[PDB]
């Protein structure tokens, strides 16, 4: 057992292995199997290059041997920070076959976060591309080493300079140590706020199960052509169903250079993508673009939007702008993933954030005092299941606060449950605005503002007030010429919005600060409004 990992209770583990949730197969097996069945099928597409399943299988074996020869051992952690390129895949499955643990960093991470990941995880290696999106990662590597002289295996996919060329590692395959389906397979990152994310241990069994359910719930098959538009190392574009779900089903993954329509649209028409995944802010950009671009996105069958709540006023437009089915996805790297079903009524797809994907996912909505709220009532969401961790990596204190004594994980979201078990998310507990003794659901107000013809997007956050404790500020991205602030308040007033929900202040910006995967960082917005106030 990996040191720092919190296992599922023995009796539950058995239940899961008995009902078949935990298949007992490793990622190594998964690839070996798929490679044997349809080796010639194209698994990955990137620009003009392609990789068959057999190809990936072979490179993974040959790379694992190189990694081992390098001195990387079973249980070793390896911080992987690659863009959406083919290497990512040979890198993780090779690590998977050596029993080494990838730690999934994002392209946007810098020395402060990377140095942390390498120290905390006591990383044996750091894997980066030479340069991506205008950033030279070797300079980041140099910054990291100067902070951690002990990190001596810096692997670069591309021009390595003084470091180690990933391409020079492949060698003759070898006998590798046994990897158990119950072993931790990798460490993911949590996505809250306050920098330093917690590390999340996921085992082969519990993760592959999450992939199998996502495949079934999302109808993926040999005909699936999934476009990876978001940084694919994030839990959402990696497994819900993600690039890994697509490989599980024998489909084909297309790698986009960036999330932007300029890059993605041609790819959708050229490669005939049948499904892609976006986060709300990007969904807005795609919808605007889809109305000004002449690309043929007709092959699109399913457009996923998640990571954050995709407001009703926007969601309802998917069918007409893209002519495909919208699928809201509400998941967390900690475990639980919810989806609106592909054959659900338009209203359920447009007004909810789905229902647990597993029959064994347990959900509870509690009130501030850990008491189950009354049916249909709004409250704190706790969850427990086959693919939901029981604790963060080496984090006793935080675990004491994040998990109930019995095993439920407090997701940090405020939600209410529907009759059929669907979840209607209000927003995160931390994003609640308590204006002078009144709670305000930010997203409720943003949805209204999205109805205004001059609003591209809106993010409402709290701001300090010495008299009311908290006031509300909404950041608006103008859909061209920015309307006046009084015009927006009046708009909301005309709609009958309760007076205390109306933004006290309006800030116009060209874009919102975002997180690694692309969601709006309300924390950054709070800092920005808080700073402006201090300026006075
Ligand atoms: N659809 C939706 N609606 C409202 N809030 C949502 C949401 N999706 C995610 N969230 C917020 O994000 C955390 C989970 O954070 P991450 O680990 O960074 O993950 C994801 O955001 C995510 C999105 C879609 C699918 C999957 O698998 C993941 O992991 C939630 O607790 C919530 O606050």
UniProtKB/Swiss-Prot annotation:
Pfam families: AMP-binding, AMP-binding_C. Its main location: cytoplasm. The keyword Transport does not apply. One of its GO terms (cellular component) is cytoplasm. GO terms for molecular function: 2,3-dihydroxybenzoate--[aryl-carrier protein] ligase; ATP binding. It is an enzyme of class 6 (ligase). InterPro entries: AMP-bd_C, AMP-bd_C_sf, AMP-binding_CS, AMP-dep_synth/lig_dom, ATP-dep_AMP-bd_enzyme, DHB_AMP_lig. Its EC number is 6.2.1.71. Substrate binds at residues 234-235, 240, 519. It is found in: Cytoplasm. Pathway: Siderophore biosynthesis; bacillibactin biosynthesis. PROSITE patterns: AMP_BINDING. It catalyses: 2,3-dihydroxybenzoate + holo-[ACP] + ATP = 2,3-dihydroxybenzoyl-[ACP] + AMP + diphosphate. GO terms for biological process: siderophore biosynthetic process. The keyword Ribonucleoprotein does not apply. Involved in the biosynthesis of the catecholic siderophore bacillibactin. Catalyzes the activation of the carboxylate group of 2,3-dihydroxy-benzoate (DHB), via ATP-dependent PPi exchange reactions, to the acyladenylate. Belongs to the ATP-dependent AMP-binding enzyme family. This is 2,3-dihydroxybenzoate-AMP ligase.
């Amino acid at each position: 057992m990996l040191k720092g990992f919190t296992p599922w209770p023995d009796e539950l583990a058995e239940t899961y292995r008995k009902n078949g949730c935990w298949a007992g197969e490793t990622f190594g097996d998964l690839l070996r199997d798929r490679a044997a069945k349809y080796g010639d099928r194209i698994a990955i597409t990137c620009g003009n290059t392609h990789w068959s399943y057999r190809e990936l299988d072979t490179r993974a074996d040959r790379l694992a041997a190189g990694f081992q020869k390098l001195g990387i051992q079973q249980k070793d952690r390896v911080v992987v920070q690659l863009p959406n390129i083919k290497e990512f895949f040979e890198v993780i499955f090779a690590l998977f076959r050596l029993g080494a643990l990838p730690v999934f960093a994002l392209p946007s991470h810098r020395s402060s976060e990377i140095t942390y990941f390498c120290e905390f995880a006591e990383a044996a290696a750091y894997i980066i591309p030479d340069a991506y999106s205008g950033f030279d990662y070797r300079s980041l590597a140099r910054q990291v080493q100067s902070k951690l002289p002990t990190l001596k295996n810096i692997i670069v996919a591309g021009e390595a300079e003084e470091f180690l060329p990933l391409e020079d590692l492949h060698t003759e395959p070898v006998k590798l140590p046994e990897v158990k389906s119950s072993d931790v397979a990798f460490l993911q990152l949590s996505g809250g706020s306050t920098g330093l994310s917690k590390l999340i241990p996921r085992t082969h069994d519990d993760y592959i199960y999450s992939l199998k359910r996502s495949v079934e719930v999302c109808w993926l098959d040999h005909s699936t052509v999934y476009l990876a538009a978001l940084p694919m190392a994030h839990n959402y574009p990696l497994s819900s169903p993600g690039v890994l779900g697509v490989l599980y089903a024998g489909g084909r993954v297309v790698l986009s250079p960036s999330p932007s329509p300029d890059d993605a649209f041609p790819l959708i028409e050229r490669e005939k993508v049948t499904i892609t995944a976006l986060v709300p802010p990007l969904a807005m950009v795609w919808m605007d673009a889809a109305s000004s671009r002449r690309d043929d996105l007709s092959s699109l069958q399913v457009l996923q939007v998640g990571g954050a709540k995709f407001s009703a006023e926007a969601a309802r437009r998917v069918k007409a702008v893209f002519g495909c089915t919208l699928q809201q996805v509400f998941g967390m790297a900690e475990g639980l993933v919810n989806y609106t079903r592909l054959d659900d009524p338009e209203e359920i797809i447009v007004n909810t954030q789905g229902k647990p994907m597993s029959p064994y996912d347990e959900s509870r909505v509690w009130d501030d005092h850990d008491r189950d709220v009354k049916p249909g009532e709004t409250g704190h969401l706790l969850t427990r299941g086959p693919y939901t961790i029981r604790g963060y990596y080496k984090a006793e204190e935080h675990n004491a606060a994040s998990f109930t004594e019995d095993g439920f994980y407090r997701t940090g979201d405020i939600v209410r449950l529907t009759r059929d078990g669907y979840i209607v998310v209000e927003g995160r507990a931390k994003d609640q605005i308590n204006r002078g003794g009144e709670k305000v659901a930010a997203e409720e107000v943003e949805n209204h503002l999205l109805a205004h013809p001059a609003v591209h997007d809106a993010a409402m956050v709290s701001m300090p007030d010495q008299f009311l404790g908290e006031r509300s500020c909404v950041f608006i991205i103008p859909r061209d010429e920015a309307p006046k602030a009084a015009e927006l308040k009046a708009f909301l007033r005309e709609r009958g919005l309760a007076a205390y929900k109306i933004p006290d202040r309006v800030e116009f910006v060209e874009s919102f600060p975002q997180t690694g995967v692309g969601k709006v960082s309300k924390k950054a917005l709070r800092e920005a409004i808080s700073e402006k106030l201090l300026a006075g």
